[PDB]
Design an enzyme around this catalytic site. Structure first.
Site, PDB file in Angstrom:
ATOM      1  N   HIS A  61       2.754  69.258 -51.022  1.00 46.81           N
ATOM      2  CA  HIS A  61       4.093  68.743 -50.733  1.00 46.81           C
ATOM      3  C   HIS A  61       5.024  69.803 -50.188  1.00 46.81           C
ATOM      4  CE1 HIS A  61       2.777  65.340 -53.152  1.00 46.81           C
ATOM      5  NE2 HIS A  61       2.577  66.155 -54.173  1.00 46.81           N
ATOM      6  N   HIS A  91      10.898  76.989 -53.287  1.00 46.04           N
ATOM      7  CA  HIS A  91      10.179  76.290 -52.238  1.00 46.04           C
ATOM      8  C   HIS A  91      11.213  75.802 -51.245  1.00 46.04           C
ATOM      9  CE1 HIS A  91      11.368  73.159 -55.073  1.00 46.04           C
ATOM     10  NE2 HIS A  91      11.577  72.442 -53.980  1.00 46.04           N
ATOM     11  N   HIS A  93      12.182  72.681 -48.053  1.00 49.06           N
ATOM     12  CA  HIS A  93      11.975  71.410 -47.375  1.00 49.06           C
ATOM     13  C   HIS A  93      12.365  71.607 -45.924  1.00 49.06           C
ATOM     14  CE1 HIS A  93      11.732  69.434 -51.350  1.00 49.06           C
ATOM     15  NE2 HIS A  93      12.545  70.428 -51.662  1.00 49.06           N
ATOM     16  N   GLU A 103      17.589  68.327 -47.539  1.00 52.45           N
ATOM     17  CA  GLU A 103      17.689  67.176 -48.429  1.00 52.45           C
ATOM     18  C   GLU A 103      19.156  66.833 -48.677  1.00 52.45           C
ATOM     19  OE1 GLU A 103      14.890  68.005 -51.769  1.00 52.45           O
ATOM     20  OE2 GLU A 103      13.641  66.637 -50.583  1.00 52.45           O
ATOM     21  N   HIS A 116      15.113  75.655 -52.322  1.00 54.96           N
ATOM     22  CA  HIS A 116      15.389  75.356 -53.731  1.00 54.96           C
ATOM     23  C   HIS A 116      14.844  76.478 -54.592  1.00 54.96           C
ATOM     24  CE1 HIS A 116      15.619  70.812 -52.719  1.00 54.96           C
ATOM     25  NE2 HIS A 116      16.715  71.473 -52.393  1.00 54.96           N
ATOM     26  N   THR A 195      14.088  66.326 -56.738  1.00 53.28           N
ATOM     27  CA  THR A 195      14.074  65.505 -55.522  1.00 53.28           C
ATOM     28  C   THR A 195      12.687  65.018 -55.183  1.00 53.28           C
ATOM     29  OG1 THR A 195      13.810  67.355 -53.973  1.00 53.28           O
ATOM     30  CG2 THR A 195      16.086  66.720 -54.602  1.00 53.28           C
ATOM     31  N   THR A 196      11.762  65.169 -56.110  1.00 49.88           N
ATOM     32  CA  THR A 196      10.415  64.886 -55.843  1.00 49.88           C
ATOM     33  C   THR A 196       9.902  64.289 -57.152  1.00 49.88           C
ATOM     34  OG1 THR A 196       8.774  66.105 -54.469  1.00 49.88           O
ATOM     35  CG2 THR A 196       9.404  66.981 -56.620  1.00 49.88           C
TER      36      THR A 196
HETATM   37  C1  LIG Z   1      10.244  71.709 -58.017  1.00 55.54           C
HETATM   38  C2  LIG Z   1       9.246  71.200 -59.045  1.00 55.54           C
HETATM   39  C3  LIG Z   1       9.260  69.906 -59.262  1.00 55.54           C
HETATM   40  C4  LIG Z   1       8.416  69.346 -60.176  1.00 55.54           C
HETATM   41  C5  LIG Z   1       8.695  67.875 -60.060  1.00 55.54           C
HETATM   42  C6  LIG Z   1       7.786  67.521 -58.880  1.00 55.54           C
HETATM   43  C7  LIG Z   1       8.316  66.821 -61.038  1.00 55.54           C
HETATM   44  N1  LIG Z   1       7.475  70.051 -60.891  1.00 55.54           N
HETATM   45  C8  LIG Z   1       6.651  69.295 -61.862  1.00 55.54           C
HETATM   46  C9  LIG Z   1       7.605  69.090 -63.065  1.00 55.54           C
HETATM   47  C10 LIG Z   1       7.109  68.537 -64.409  1.00 55.54           C
HETATM   48  C11 LIG Z   1       7.043  67.232 -64.804  1.00 55.54           C
HETATM   49  N2  LIG Z   1       6.608  67.199 -66.045  1.00 55.54           N
HETATM   50  C12 LIG Z   1       6.424  68.465 -66.456  1.00 55.54           C
HETATM   51  N3  LIG Z   1       6.757  69.277 -65.438  1.00 55.54           N
HETATM   52  C13 LIG Z   1       7.487  71.433 -60.695  1.00 55.54           C
HETATM   53  C14 LIG Z   1       6.571  72.537 -61.299  1.00 55.54           C
HETATM   54  C15 LIG Z   1       7.227  73.925 -61.397  1.00 55.54           C
HETATM   55  C16 LIG Z   1       5.798  72.339 -62.606  1.00 55.54           C
HETATM   56  C17 LIG Z   1       8.374  71.956 -59.742  1.00 55.54           C
HETATM   57 ZN   LIG Z   2      12.883  71.034 -53.561  1.00 52.41          ZN
END
Ligand SMILES: Cc1cc(C(C)C)[n+](CCc2cnc[nH]2)c(C(C)C)c1
Ligand SMILES: [Zn+2]
EC number: 4.2.1.1
Length: 257
Positions: A61, A91, A93, A103, A116, A195-196
């Protein structure tokens, strides 16, 4: 599984993640005339001098530059925040064209990309716990425009060849995220979400007023990444951005006049 294509993109996410239609979703349009200056907002404290970058990962992504977050090494404090938030990763976008990719938008203007820097509140012990809390995350959002090159971004650009496809990672130590910050730390802030997916409503958004500029060559190299894994049909990693969501019952505050 979710993504940014015609059939799995942002308009579909609500079917697996109903919070996509929730009360504090991100990103949003920042209407600069409607944001209210808040003099009680403190200056941001960005303390990155002891940052320990570890690795860069193409997760299908975006690409994440990951940091050691097992100690207070790179932390965000102040501004609208109470307590200490540790940097876990950053990261971007970005768009297929320079006229889109961010975004957040500013008076409906789209920037070429958006950075971000993701931080979590140390009072919750780890990132997985923090995302379950309304004040769990603090994300520093920084807009990118195309113009002059950003010297502090070039080390990121130069490693992207080694993580072209989903699941590839590379060692990425000794990277200094201070080289990605603009001169001013003036910001807007509002309560929002990841945002994801899973789109959890755990983020205090701090969006910097001043963009950084990157060169056309730098953003072109972002657009050579792949959403797919190695040996799958090539789909360029471009337009990995969620569009602006309704502001609903929120006020955006500004740190500046
Ligand atoms: C920017 C970012 C966003 C997420 C979102 C996709 C759910 N995630 C997964 C977040 C998460 C959902 N449940 C536990 N961790 C992460 C990483 C660092 C683990 C980073
Ligand atoms: Zn982001």
């Amino acid at each position: 599984h979710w993504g940014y294509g015609k059939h799995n993109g942002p308009e579909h996410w609500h079917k697996d993640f109903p919070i996509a239609k929730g009360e504090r979703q991100s990103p949003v349009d920042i209407d600069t005339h409607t944001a209210k200056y808040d003099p009680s907002l403190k200056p941001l404290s960005v303390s990155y001098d002891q940052a320990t970058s570890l690795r860069i990962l193409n997760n299908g992504h975006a690409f994440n530059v990951e940091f050691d977050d097992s100690q207070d090494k790179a932390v965000l404090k102040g501004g609208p925040l109470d307590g200490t938030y540790r940097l876990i990763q950053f990261h971007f976008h970005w768009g297929s064209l320079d006229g889109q990719g961010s975004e957040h938008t500013v008076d409906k203007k789209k920037y070429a990309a958006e950075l971000h820097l993701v931080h979590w509140n140390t009072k919750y012990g780890d990132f997985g716990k923090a995302v379950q809390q309304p004040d769990g995350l603090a994300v520093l959002g920084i807009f990118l425009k195309v113009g002059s090159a950003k010297p502090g971004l070039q080390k990121v650009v130069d490693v992207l060849d080694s993580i072209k496809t989903k699941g590839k990672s590379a060692d990425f130590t000794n990277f200094d995220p201070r080289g990605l910050l603009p001169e001013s730390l003036d910001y807007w802030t509002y309560p929002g979400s990841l945002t994801t997916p899973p789109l959890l409503e755990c983020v205090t958004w701090i969006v910097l007023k001043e963009p950084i500029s990157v060169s056309s060559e730098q953003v072109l190299k972002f657009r050579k990444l792949n959403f797919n894994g190695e040996g799958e049909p090539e789909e360029l990693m471009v337009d990995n951005w969620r569009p602006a969501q309704p502001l609903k019952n929120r006020q955006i505050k500004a740190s500046f006049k």
